[PDB]
Write a protein that binds this ligand. Structure first.
Ligand SMILES: COc1cc(Cl)c(C#N)cc1C(=O)NCCN1CCC(C(=O)c2ccc(F)cc2)CC1
Ligand code: NA
Length: 201
């Protein structure tokens, strides 16, 4: 079973994660259409996900990856947001449920990019209660994950890939989207619960 460790706001970790989330908010080409309009998040809570099976699968996989990437995991903390966060923290990422760079699992360096996906592709129909993509009431969830990138393949054009190219373990596509093709190359380290904040007048 999954265990959620509740981080205290006075925790360096907590602060470190919130800092990464707040500082990577950016203006998106859609003018806020998908994720809403905001400049800052109100972080309700940050929790650490502990799940033995997921950890085991993740360790097993980075082992194979480093073994192919000159003994380097090439790990990176990245954000992921989607309507399946809950299934993810219990069963892990699943590429069978998978896109601009193929049937992979996507991660963003910008928290605001992930927020655009919290309610679905293009933000879907927004939050359940108000059908509002820029809802300032409803609590959103986002993950800040350890992603095993290994040897990244650089893709500069949309392509429907099924897996990373031979000898590769991830695809950095072009900002840049980080895409892996195996659920085990990502561990949902932090579960962030938050609200976007309405900018002041
Ligand atoms: C191209 O789509 C994206 C791009 C970005 Cl940049 C981000 C972010 N940040 C998230 C998505 C996304 O959620 N796509 C939908 C397809 N995903 C497939 C894998 C799914 C998954 O891992 C899962 C695991 C267990 C389940 F029970 C259900 C789904 C999540 C949904
Ligand atoms: Na995804």
């Amino acid at each position: 079973g999954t265990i959620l460790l509740d981080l205290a706001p006075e925790d360096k970790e907590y602060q470190s994660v919130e800092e990464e989330m707040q500082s990577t908010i950016r203006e998106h080409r859609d003018g806020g259409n998908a994720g809403g309009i905001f400049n800052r998040y109100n972080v309700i809570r940050i929790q650490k996900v502990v799940n033995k099976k997921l950890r085991e699968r993740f360790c097993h996989r980075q082992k194979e990856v480093s073994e192919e990437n000159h003994n380097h995991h090439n790990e990176r903390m990245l954000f992921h947001g989607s309507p399946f966060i809950n299934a993810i923290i219990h069963k892990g990422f699943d590429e069978r449920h998978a896109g601009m760079f193929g049937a992979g699992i996507y991660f963003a360096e910008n928290s605001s990019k992930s927020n655009q996906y919290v309610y679905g592709i293009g933000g879907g129909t927004g939050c359940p209660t108000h059908k509002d993509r820029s809802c300032y009431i409803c609590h959103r969830q986002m993950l800040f994950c350890r992603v095993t990138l290994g040897k990244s393949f650089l893709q500069f054009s949309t392509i429907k890939m099924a897996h990373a190219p031979p000898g590769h373990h991830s695809v950095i596509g072009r900002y840049a989207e980080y895409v892996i093709y195996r659920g085990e190359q990502a561990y949902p380290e932090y579960l962030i619960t938050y609200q976007i904040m309405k900018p002041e007048a």
